[PDB]
From a paper:
The crystal structures of [name] in complex with single- and double-stranded DNA presented here indicate that the domains may also be used for binding of modified DNA. Single-stranded DNAs are bound very similarly to the proximal strand of dsDNA. The [name] and dsDNA molecules in the crystals are bound to the N-terminal domains. The other structures were solved by molecular replacement. Except for the weaker diffracting crystals of [name] with dsDNA, the resolution of the data reached around 1.5 Å. Although crystals without DNA, with [name], and with dsDNA grew in different space groups, the protein conformation was remarkably similar in all structures, with the exception of two loops in proximity of the DNA (residues 24–34 and 72–84). The DNA binding site of the C-terminal [name] domains is consistently empty in all structures.
Modification dependent restriction endonucleases (MDREs) specifically target DNA that is modified, and are non-toxic to a host with non-modified DNA. Many modification-dependent restriction endonucleases (MDREs) are fusions of a PUA superfamily modification sensor domain and a nuclease catalytic domain. [name] domains belong to the PUA superfamily, and are present in MDREs in combination with [name] nuclease domains. In all crystal structures, [name] protomers have the predicted two domain architecture, with N-terminal domains of the PUA superfamily (residues 1–147), linker helices (148–178), and C-terminal [name] domains (residues 179–309).
Numbering used by the authors:
A (entry chain A), B (entry chain A): 1 to 309
The structure:
DNA sequence: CACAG
DNA sequence: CACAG
């Protein structure tokens, strides 16, 4: 996942109200722009800090690649000098209560500014350009200054999108793989959604939500332990590579906010706000031994899915 | 009539789309602002040049005095530092095709900038403040640069409003004047709209539109020659102080785009675009002698109403 | 160049 | 001060 800084002093209200970013494809004189070319590097799930009137107003999530689109008519005079041939990105804005003023924090972030194409000068004034790459270390510092609301956009939210993208591509690869038969293709695709032979096989091993004890099939998700995307075809359909979980527990486990020790002890991520466990009446403690086959997968989950600092 | 310059780079689209001007009543620190206090001097009919992104985008007509109003919610971050307690004016925007860039013309307008509270610096850069008085000589120069569309907002349009305001006040004075009887009050008020005993008396003198020859009562306006606002009570009800005119001819005569010599020769103002007379098939020439009584009033019209350079 | 200053 | 720069 990448971080971006979009400078929107001229058109923030129009871009926010329309849920987009927009730039020309080239400078007015027809020359290439590093900044406009950055539009073509943004991926769905990338986090975009909106900077306008000296403040960071939004921690946004990109929901498209750049697509060819005319300059928005609603820019009017404020956009007069930009070419009509442009790039648009669908940006899911998340307005923040703590609108940080980066110049007021320049001593804290200066060491983390990139040597080239920095969104800020060494004195903390913004540079006049549209879209800048933000190094991960600089992004961390900005998130520290904004507080919890910035972390809430990123962890188990923005950072899930690239995983979904990867899984979508694998689903395409399976559907076109000549080495596997039609039934296998169908069962592998269903297993991604906890359906088909995977669910029936899991039901021979597990009977309830580990955490909430619910037994009712219509209130349980068939979750993989080793994620579907990184499982091989045998592991994708293995009844021992799953748990039946209530939907909120599925959410916490799938995103690595929780995991389990081999003996069933729940492990809670530092990225899980404990006020979530209180609100949903989920206790820390022991949720029963796992089988040797389940433990092999749970080891993978602890080492690769579970969120650690 | 006064001219104003409103600098709207931060909020032009919101002010244009809402048909308003807005400022705080005081600076953020509670101190008086000359610029915000200018809001309380604007009169209906005053002309306001909108300046944004270095261009004059509108020649507007004020349609209210300033009224106490909260800062528009649609300003958002762009208006964050302004106090919520403000002044609003209803401004009738007229967008111009020729968006002049004053800095590109600074040699032409510099000699006409006021010594104090100028909207422009001597180098042609704008001053950072909201609302500036524009001297009449500076306004003329700006109108010369914009062209016909600016003149069209002012002459026989914006500059009629203060006349209507004056006439409204006189109507109030008449309605409250203890020296005249109820019938007189009614007849004086009706006469302003070409109704009542004035119309009946005019119909004993005139029978047709001087210019178009229409005789049909339902297609004729009873127009004063010496305007109702500056006529005394005898002159307001005098059948010899009027003409029956087709509505377009009433428009041209009432606003002083045309007048007449005592012998009936039509006089055409330099402020009348001749393409109006062509479009409406109105010929220059002679429209019949006026009576001695009518000539006394027509002298007043030529000397005071007729538009001369 | 140039969505900030 | 500060609706531009
Ligand atoms: Cl495209
Ligand atoms: Cl620098
Ligand atoms: Cl008021
Ligand atoms: Cl100066």
């Amino acid at each position: 996942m990448n971080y971006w800084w979009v400078s929107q002093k001229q058109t923030f209200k129009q871009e926010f109200e329309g849920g987009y970013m927009w730039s020309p494809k080239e400078n007015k004189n027809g020359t290439q722009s590093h900044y406009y070319n950055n539009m073509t590097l943004v991926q769905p799930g990338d986090v975009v800090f909106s900077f306008a009137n000296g403040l960071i107003l939004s921690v946004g999530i990109a929901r498209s690649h750049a697509y060819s689109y005319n300059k928005p008519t609603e820019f009017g005079v404020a956009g007069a000098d930009w070419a009509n041939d442009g790039w648009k990105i669908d940006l899911e804005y998340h307005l923040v209560e703590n609108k940080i003023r980066p110049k007021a924090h320049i001593d804290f972030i200066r060491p983390y500014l990139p040597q080239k194409y920095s969104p800020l000068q060494d004195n903390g004034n913004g540079n006049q350009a549209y879209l800048f790459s933000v190094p991960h270390e600089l992004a961390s510092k900005v998130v520290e200054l904004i507080g919890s609301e910035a972390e809430e956009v990123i962890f188990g939210f923005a950072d899930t999108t690239e995983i979904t993208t990867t899984a979508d591509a694998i689903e395409c690869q399976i559907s076109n793989d000549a080495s596997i038969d039609e039934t296998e293709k169908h069962q592998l695709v269903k297993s991604r959604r906890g359906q088909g032979i995977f669910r029936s096989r899991l039901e021979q091993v597990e009977s309830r939500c580990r955490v909430t004890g619910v037994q009712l099939k219509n209130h349980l998700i068939a979750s993989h332990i080793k994620p579907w995307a990184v499982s091989n075809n045998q592991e994708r359909l293995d009844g021992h590579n799953g748990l039946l979980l209530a939907p909120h527990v599925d959410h916490l486990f799938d995103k690595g906010f929780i995991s389990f020790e081999d003996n069933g002890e729940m492990i809670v991520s530092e990225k899980l706000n404990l006020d979530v466990l209180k609100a949903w009446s989920i206790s820390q403690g022991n949720y029963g031994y796992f089988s040797k086959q389940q433990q092999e997968y749970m080891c993978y989950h602890r080492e690769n899915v579970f969120k650690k600092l």
